[PDB]
């Protein structure tokens, strides 16, 4: 299996990186500016949630052109060592923040939709900015080892330094891959496996309530039921079609490190992984259109 990587990984990857940076920056900036405009007018219980998602998205895409240039220079990172650490930590913090804010907005919607009596009496706190603050702090603590372990070192003496992350600072060389597998498993679990379950159960309860209330007997009722179920399923589908690639491929790689999958499959995984990251940014790029811009009230606030 003396195969390194697909050739286009150095040509198209910077291009799509730059392009999705453009789209994400434009969309997130416009939605955040309109949210800042309408924060004192709409007074939505989840305006803070979409605002936190937008700022997380900004900070997610700002450092992406660094990887665009890094992949343009094959696999060399010339921006710097501390810059490598800062970009990796920022992107991981924004990763966790985006997922946690999406599930927090799901929980807010469940509390304000399924039971507007007592679930709202528990929603009074998740509606305040304290929930966003604790979510951000928790995400920062989860992404802390990325800062702690990120470094910059040249490998194979190619005089072309890569933005890898050091591990000998805290972990042994012998159990090094074991420590890395543990870190990856913890990241995947605490970042997707639990929060995605909260999101899906919240939206399933919301769909159950909407289906129970709205009926086909009303011409407007059936259309509104179809529209609401459509947006809910589109949201869950975009989540479970954007986040399966990255985390699924990474978990498959971790499993293969202990299952002896054929080497060709391993090479295929490491080659598709940048595309998986591209899909990861694309998720956050289309997130504002699916959360804020989808709201007619948000649209009329824009206009």
């Amino acid at each position, epitope marked *: *299996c003396e195969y390194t990587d697909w050739k286009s990984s150095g040509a198209l990857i910077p291009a799509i990186y730059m392009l999705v940076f453009l789209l994400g920056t434009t969309g997130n900036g416009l939605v955040l500016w309109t949210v800042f405009r309408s924060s004192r007018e709409k007074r939505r219980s989840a305006d803070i949630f979409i605002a936190s998602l937008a700022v997380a998205d900004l900070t997610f895409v700002v450092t992406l052109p660094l990887w665009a240039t890094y992949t343009y220079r094959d696999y060399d990172w010339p921006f710097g060592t501390f810059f490598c650490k800062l970009s990796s930590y920022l992107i991981f913090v924004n990763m966790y923040a985006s997922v946690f804010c999406l599930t927090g907005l799901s929980f807010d919607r469940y509390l304000a939709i399924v039971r507007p009596v007592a679930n709202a009496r528990l929603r009074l706190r998740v509606s305040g900015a304290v929930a966003t603050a604790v979510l951000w702090v928790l995400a920062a603590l989860l992404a802390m080892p990325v800062m702690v372990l990120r470094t910059t070192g040249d490998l194979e003496n190619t005089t072309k330094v890569q933005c890898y992350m050091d591990y000998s600072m805290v972990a042994t060389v012998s159990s090094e891959w074991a420590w890395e597998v543990g870190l990856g498993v913890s990241s995947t679990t605490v970042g997707f496996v639990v929060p995605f379950t909260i999101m899906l159960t919240c939206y399933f309860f919301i769909a159950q309530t909407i289906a129970g209330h709205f009926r086909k007997e009303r011409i407007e009722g059936l259309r509104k039921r179809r529209r609401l179920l459509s947006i809910i399923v589109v949201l869950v589908v975009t989540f479970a079609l954007c986040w399966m690639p990255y985390h699924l491929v990474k978990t498959l790689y971790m499993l293969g490190s202990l299952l002896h999958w054929p080497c060709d499959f391993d090479l295929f995984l490491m080659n598709i992984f940048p595309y998986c990251t591209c899909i990861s940014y694309v998720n956050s790029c289309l997130n504002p259109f699916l959360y804020a811009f989808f709201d007619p009230r948000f649209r009329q606030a824009c206009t």
Partner: nanobody, 130 residues
Framework: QVQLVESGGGSVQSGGSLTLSCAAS????????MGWFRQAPGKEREGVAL???????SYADSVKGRFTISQDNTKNILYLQMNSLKPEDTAMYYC????????????????????????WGQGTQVTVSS
């Protein structure tokens, strides 16, 4: 960590052929790629062929186009089918395995900058005749 033993060392004259194989335990292309390093008696340990993300055919300039390495994850073996023995090729070949860097944004590279602190073999003194 990874246990790996070289196999070979038969005496072959100048211009001969032999396959140097090092079998590792707990070393997969996914996790731990493997490399080949030499020891001529009273010399310094130079690389032979290294399995890295860049190039992927990191054969030493002295042995470019003549030696042939082969890493097989299925049978956890590192073939080195050298060609054309020279008396200078008499060396104690240390097969070494180092882990692979992360995939997130590193690129799944083999940390050959940590080879000295990694896992070297016992080394097999391949005998070469003329």
């Amino acid at each position: 960590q990874v246990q790996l033993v070289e196999s070979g060392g038969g005496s072959v004259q100048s211009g001969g052929s032999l396959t140097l194989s090092c079998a590792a335990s707990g070393s997969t292309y996914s996790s731990h790629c493997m490399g080949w390093f030499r020891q001529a008696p009273g010399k310094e340990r130079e690389g032979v062929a290294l399995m890295t993300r860049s190039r992927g055919t990191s054969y030493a300039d002295s042995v470019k186009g003549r030696f042939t390495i082969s890493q097989d994850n299925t049978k956890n073996i590192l073939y080195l089918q050298m060609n054309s023995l020279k008396p200078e090729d008499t060396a104690m070949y240390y097969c070494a395995a180092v882990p692979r860097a992360g995939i997130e944004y590193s690129g799944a590279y083999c940390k050959w900058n940590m080879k000295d602190s990694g896992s070297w073999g016992q080394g097999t003194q391949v005998t070469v005749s003329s």
